[PDB]
């Protein structure tokens, strides 16, 4: 029903710089029903930001989400050596929920 | 602490049916909590199965799984069940069940808790 | 004592259909002669539990006003109609005060209400924001929101329909079949009498 295309495919910045990721939809747009997960290699994904304003418990103040319409953006202040993993966008509002494609961040 | 534990690794034959469970630990499904099921291969895109509300019992399915999957909940021992029928050799994957922190009054809007994952192999 | 008038207790007890739990109908009884001889004598009564007066000395008292409430609940929940209890149906559907006067009659009705093909017209409230006060009724079906974010329109995540439907079938064992419940309320000796019957000799 809905599709969430992600970009850019790969990002590689030095540890200490700010990074950004974008994911966009095509059909009707809802704002406060988007969440960003990350999947470490071999382990189940965990929640990072949901609702664009409320973070998960224990997550530091580093991550920040935004976006109003079709586009949605996630920003990371700095890349600590453990912050290298895949990222996924998910939405709940519309017809049967779908996940993103998956983007990887490198060093 | 709040956590969900699933079943063990499973090997199955094509055609037959499989039955997967995940149960909380120090946590109760209460009445408002939801629970969604996802499927994921070895390093590929996440796939969504469906979600059910433990209280009202209303369910929802993806149109691809409209005919050969069933989701069930049990408040008694606070557990959740998936039943899959007509298994095939390309269904070898890992299945997860997710649910948020939630207790009896009002609760969150994000799938915080996630299972440990059970490998299902068909051959 | 002649007597000629008769209160319509039969109309309360022999109705073809009772209302749901969350929309219980309340009937006033006044300007008639009440005769409990035909009431208590009937056979299939299951629980005739009575609080402020002895169930036998009713006939020698004159009541200022009588109110009758009727509904249909599960067998397991019948214990929640007593005053001072606490539960889902004693907090979100119907509760009795702590100074209750009057008393209650509950009897099994599996032969009439249940249908083999599936009876789906007996609802009950499942979510609410706060505990209700005694003898209070609500009908609105506004979508109950659970998350911190506002909700409107159609259901979805943290947006649930507050009413479910009873599943009544004869195959269910004892404890799930419907028990018809009637509650009588009245006041004592503070106002002109309106309802009472003759005293026997």
Author numbering:
A (entry chain L): 1 to 107
B (entry chain H): 1 to 123
C (entry chain E): 330 to 530
Question: What's the paper's own text on this?
Answer:
XGv347 bound to an epitope at the tip of the RBD, largely overlapping with the patch targeted by ACE2. The XGv347 paratope comprised 5 CDRs with heavy chain and light chain contributing 70% and 30% of the binding surface area, respectively. Structural comparisons revealed that XGv347 is very similar to A23-58.1, an ultrapotent and broadly reactive neutralizing antibody effective against 23 SARS-CoV-2 variants, but marked differences could be observed in the complementarity-determining region (CDR) domains. Furthermore, the residues of the epitope of XGv347 match with a major subset of those targeted by S2K146, another broadly cross-reactive sarbecovirus neutralizing antibody, highlighting a plausible capability of these neutralizing antibodies to cross-neutralize Omicron and circulating SARS-CoV-2 variants. XGv347 exhibited tight binding to WT S primarily owing to extensive hydrophobic interactions contributed by F456, Y473, F486 and Y489 from WT RBD, V32, V53, W51, P100 and F111 from the heavy chain, Y33 from the light chain, and nine hydrogen bonds. Hydrophobic interactions between the Omicron RBD and XGv347 were largely maintained. However, substitutions of Y505H and K417N abolished three hydrogen bonds formed with K75, D31 and E104 from the heavy chain complementarity-determining regions (HCDRs), leading to conformational shifts in HCDR3 and the RBM tip (residues 470–490), which further perturbed six hydrogen bonds built by Y473, A475, S477, T478 and Q493 from WT RBD with T105, C107, A56, G55 and D109 from the HCDRs, albeit with an extra hydrogen bond established by the mutation Q493R and G55 from HCDR2 for Omicron.
